[PDB]
Design a protein around this ligand. Structure first.
Ligand SMILES: [Cl-]
Ligand SMILES: [Cl-]
Length: 551
């Protein structure tokens, strides 16, 4: 049954033509699985635009729950040398990247819908990624699918990256047949999470990705110019306000994956997405491993299936026994302990200030009487200042950290600050983690702040996570000393007794380089306001401090 038919030969993806295909899929789990694929189905939007889709379904009678995903990357798409750190990603041949594998889902009696959103495949309409107008298009395909002859009315959305962002968007519209959702690592506020980091423009990945969309659909003259967008809209203004999902409208039952490894792209938002959703039924899975790798691991496919079985098949399984938070405490690279909790942020987090001392470059439990100033050269990529704490007992830090600094510059009216948290083993050697974008030489946590963008949103800011307004640039007179609070992105790490936490503040990127030379898969921040010495002031009135989430 689920052993498949070794007798049959597998269908190759360019054997399949418009219309009805009977195909034999190379299922990772279930062998040679027969099914029906409708290639180049169309769904008509309110305005008349046709979106193109693929439909994979069991070759049998009945109505089935529907698992759907939607993007603009190519519905028909089909690495060890090229991008060796992507890890192990097993899927059938009928699985575009990050989508639900019909070779897994369909033999378990689901329909899979793969949606090419507006401006992709054979649509030449407006392509405006991760906007409300795209979500409205998605809304209509969900509702269309609830009414078809192979459908049981129950639609669940699923998938990774772009295929997650679009889920946050469309769930915010509350489609009546959206019964469950799995945004498996997706941002939902482009200004704060991909276009800029603490107000500093992303000159790497962001551009890469937007340029990549242009290059894919070359005959489409209607692709939104997001490169110009970034250039024209340096503040969180009306353009960017429309690209922050209204998360608290989400009511749909929710399974979120966040990852400690994705800081600088999907990490901040996956957490905001779980936090802010109004969903009465919501669950969060957090891991410190690789992205696509973890989505397709059998363990996590079974986690997804158990969720969808309960909500789309309405089946009595034990899904609701799942703790609302399951999270990895990272010890080393591909080594840690999974724990559970009933909420994120962790209810038993004790936010603990550690005070910085520029005089001996320590962190400290108690305030520093003596006032002091640490300096570094902001244009020198080899220069930074560090502050370290060695733990006398095993300690786990899980959640947001907040670096609070007093700072000044003299050769400029603005400052770009790059913050990092590193772990140092008992020998004094840095302990590396998976980090963005699939780098293996990463650190514990990372965060950024253009200092003219230091204004706090008081009603959204908290002890562990500052929220910045991004509406007024408060430029600097020299040598004006100002308080900043920097958001270190969510992380989960064990510091054993005799291991060290190091805060690093720098004028440029702290971990340098990426896992694809000559290709900008990682954020880069090459457009900087930095000049001359940065001053970090500590001790006395200058209560510079790191707030840590001890759990
Ligand atoms: Cl937290
Ligand atoms: Cl906001």
């Amino acid at each position: 049954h689920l052993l498949g038919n070794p007798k049959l030969t597998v269908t190759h993806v360019n054997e399949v033509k418009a219309g009805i295909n009977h195909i034999v899929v190379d299922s990772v789990q279930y062998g040679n699985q027969e099914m029906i694929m409708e290639k180049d189905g169309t769904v008509e939007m309110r305005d008349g635009e046709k979106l193109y889709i693929n439909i994979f379904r069991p070759n049998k009678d009945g109505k089935f729950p529907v698992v759907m995903s939607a993007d603009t990357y190519g519905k028909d798409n089909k690495m060890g040398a090229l991008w060796p750190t992507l890890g192990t990603i097993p899927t059938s041949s009928f699985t575009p990247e990050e989508s639900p594998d019909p070779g897994f889902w369909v033999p378990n009696d689901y329909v899979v819908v793969k949606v090419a959103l507006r401006g992709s495949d054979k649509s030449k309409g407006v392509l405006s990624p991760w906007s409300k107008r795209e979500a409205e298009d998605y809304y209509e395909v969900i509702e269309w699918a609830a009414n078809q002859s192979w459908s049981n009315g129950n639609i669940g959305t699923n998938g990774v990256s772009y295929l997650a962002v679009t889920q946050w968007w469309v769930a915010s519209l509350n489609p009546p047949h959206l019964k469950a959702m799995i945004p498996w690592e997706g941002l939902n506020d482009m200004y704060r999470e991909v276009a800029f980091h603490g107000g500093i423009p992303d000159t790497g990945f962001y551009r890469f990705w937007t340029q990549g969309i242009f290059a894919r659909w070359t005959d489409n003259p209607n692709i939104e110019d997001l490169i110009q967008a970034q250039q024209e809209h340096p503040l969180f203004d009306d353009f960017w306000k429309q690209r922050q999902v209204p998360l608290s409208q989400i009511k749909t039952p929710l399974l979120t994956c966040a990852s400690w490894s994705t800081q600088g792209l999907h990490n901040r938002g996956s957490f905001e997405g779980f936090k802010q959703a109004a969903s009465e039924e919501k669950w969060l899975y957090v891991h410190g491993r690789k992205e696509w790798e973890s989505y397709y691991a059998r363990e996590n496919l079974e986690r997804q299936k158990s969720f969808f079985d309960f909500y789309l098949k309405e089946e009595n399984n034990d899904w609701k026994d799942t703790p609302h938070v399951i999270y990895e405490v990272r010890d080393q690279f591909y080594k840690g302990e999974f724990k559970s909790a009933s909420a994120f942020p962790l209810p038993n987090a004790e936010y603990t200030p550690l005070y910085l001392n520029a005089e001996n470059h320590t962190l400290n439990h108690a305030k520093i009487s003596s006032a002091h100033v640490a300096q570094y050269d902001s244009e020198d990529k080899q220069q930074d200042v560090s502050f370290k704490y060695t733990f006398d007992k095993d300690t786990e830090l899980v959640g947001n950290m907040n670096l609070k600094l007093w700072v000044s510059t003299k050769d400029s009216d603005d400052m770009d600050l790059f913050a990092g948290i590193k772990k140092l083993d008992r020998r004094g050697n840095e302990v590396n983690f998976p980090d963005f974008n699939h780098i293996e030489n990463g650190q514990v946590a990372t965060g950024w702040l253009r200092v003219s963008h230091r204004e706090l949103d008081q009603e959204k800011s908290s002890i562990a996570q500052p929220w910045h307004k991004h509406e007024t640039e408060l430029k600097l007179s020299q040598d004006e000393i100002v308080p900043v609070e920097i958001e270190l992105l969510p992380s989960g790490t064990l510091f054993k007794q005799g291991e060290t936490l190091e805060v690093v503040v720098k004028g440029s990127e702290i971990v340098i380089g990426n896992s694809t030379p000559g290709m900008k898969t990682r954020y880069e921040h090459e457009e900087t306001v930095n000049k001359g010495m940065h001053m970090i002031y500590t001790g006395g009135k200058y209560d510079s401090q790191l707030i840590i989430p001890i759990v």
